[PDB]
Design a protein around this ligand. Structure first.
Ligand code: UDP
Length: 443
């Protein structure tokens, strides 16, 4: 089998989509998740098998149980490494010895476990080459902590980054590591021992990040294999209207709105917004006058007031979750106010949707700088002198992407990069070639 081990978390999907392409080439993929996830979510179905490891919490969410990130990661290491070793053996004794383990390098222990079982290893980077190479330069002891704008400027000048990153653009996990010690460590340790792997893969495409992808290839052997999204969305027949059309209620609401009218709004599945920040965001939405689809997760929605909910009835719809790809592909969608996590960003690119970037941390500040300055596909919200996002700024940015003098600039770039994304994943494209090379290596 090809074992697929994402970080246990929507974001099995990029690795799953990679695994679907390997199944097209005749390989046999297995999704490896936690016992808890395997008990409490439906499996992927054909062409996947499913298997499990433990993170120490088989009957409740370990992440909820251990909200301190270092504690959660040490527990997942201890239990995960034990149980992954047991799974490699049980697999072999069942007549399915693993050919290769494709794993998220936030799990380094998984590489060591697999290699000690004699199983080939393929790291799967799920963040942009621009961010990954900065973490790798710190891992390789070419940059000290903290990483500064001066350090990023050198990388720019040397042709490795394609844009000059300022203070609000460098990755905070290394530019302000004291804020998030575990996340600093996890981001750097991704790279420690990556040179031992058989393969290194990244969910990006070369045309998007050319200098950064070329440096990741030459430095870390990283091969671009994305955007790792469903083939439908990439216009790839091998096997405007969406033939993959669901029955989700929010989609029915979208069908009633005019073309390119709707603002999709999401800050993803991990960040939390306090009542004050929800209020700024929501009132900005309403003040814009645009139709909007606002994703407010079930675990966050207690923070929404009655009155702000009611204000959003006029032109908006609030949902706990949406089929984000299907939304972004819909003809009514005019822009995406996103935290600019990488998955959301790639989904916006593949659909040619302009962005309003509202980053928090992780990869999002850096991505947001690329969206506004290199890619040209949107704008970034400007925080006040106290670091607060104001309703007026939410509104301004929405209006500036939908109505401003540069409206066509952001759409033109979005559409340009859409086409290049689709090219990369179609037959003979830069990312398809690397997928086919890997499939043949493990056949
Ligand atoms: O209502 C939602 C919110 C999110 N997602 C999916 O969740 C992922 C979020 O990943 P991202 O890297 O953007 O941010 P994170 O959630 O990890 O911060 C993407 O694949 C989204 O399409 C979705 O399908 N529906």
């Amino acid at each position: 089998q090809v074992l697929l081990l994402p970080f246990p978390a929507g974001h099995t999907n990029p690795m799953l989509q990679f695994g679907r392409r390997l199944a097209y080439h005749g390989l046999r993929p297995t999704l490896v998740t936690t016992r808890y996830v395997l008990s409490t979510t439906p499996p992927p179905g054909d062409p996947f098998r499913v298997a499990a490891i433990s993170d120490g919490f088989d009957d409740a969410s370990g992440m909820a149980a251990l909200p301190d990130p270092g504690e959660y990661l040490r527990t997942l290491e201890a239990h995960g490494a034990r149980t992954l070793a047991e799974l490699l053996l049980s697999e072999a004794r069942a007549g399915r010895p693993a050919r290769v383990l494709v794993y998220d390098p936030h799990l380094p222990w998984a590489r060591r476990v697999a290699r000690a079982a004699g199983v080939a290893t393929a790291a799967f980077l799920s963040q942009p080459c621009a961010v990954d190479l900065i973490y790798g330069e710190v891992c390789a002891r070419r940059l000290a902590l903290p990483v500064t704008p001066t350090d990023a400027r050198g990388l720019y000048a040397r042709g490795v980054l394609g844009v000059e990153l300022g203070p609000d653009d460098v990755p905070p996990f290394v530019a302000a590591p004291e804020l998030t010690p575990a996340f600093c460590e996890a981001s750097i340790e991704q790279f420690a021992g990556l040179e031992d792997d058989d393969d290194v893969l990244v969910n990006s495409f070369s045309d998007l990040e050319p200098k950064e992808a070329a440096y990741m290839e030459s430095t870390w052997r990283a091969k671009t294999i994305g955007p790792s999204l469903p083939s439908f969305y990439l216009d790839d027949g091998r096997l405007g209207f969406n033939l993959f059309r669901s029955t989700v209620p929010c989609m029915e609401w979208l069908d009633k709105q005019p073309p390119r009218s709707v603002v999709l709004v999401s800050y993803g599945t991990v960040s939390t917004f306090d009542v004050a920040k929800l209020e700024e965001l929501g009132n900005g939405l309403c003040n814009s006058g645009k139709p909007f689809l606002w994703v407010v997760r079930s675990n966050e929605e207690h923070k929404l007031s009655v009155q702000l909910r009611k204000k959003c009835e006029k032109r908006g719809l609030i949902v706990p979750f949406c089929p984000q790809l299907e939304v972004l592909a819909h003809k009514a969608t005019g822009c995406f106010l996103s935290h600019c996590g990488w998955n959301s960003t790639l989904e916006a690119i593949v659909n040619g949707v302009p962005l309003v970037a509202m980053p928090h941390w992780a990869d999002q500040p850096t991505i947001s700088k690329y969206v506004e300055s290199l890619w040209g596909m949107g704008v970034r919200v400007q925080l006040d002198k106290s670091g607060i996002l104001q309703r007026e700024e939410v509104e301004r940015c929405i209006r500036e992407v939908m109505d401003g003098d540069r409206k066509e600039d952001y759409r033109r770039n979005a559409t340009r990069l859409m086409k290049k994304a689709k090219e990369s994943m179609q037959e003979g494209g830069s990312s398809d070639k690397n997928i086919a090379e890997f499939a043949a290596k493990y056949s």
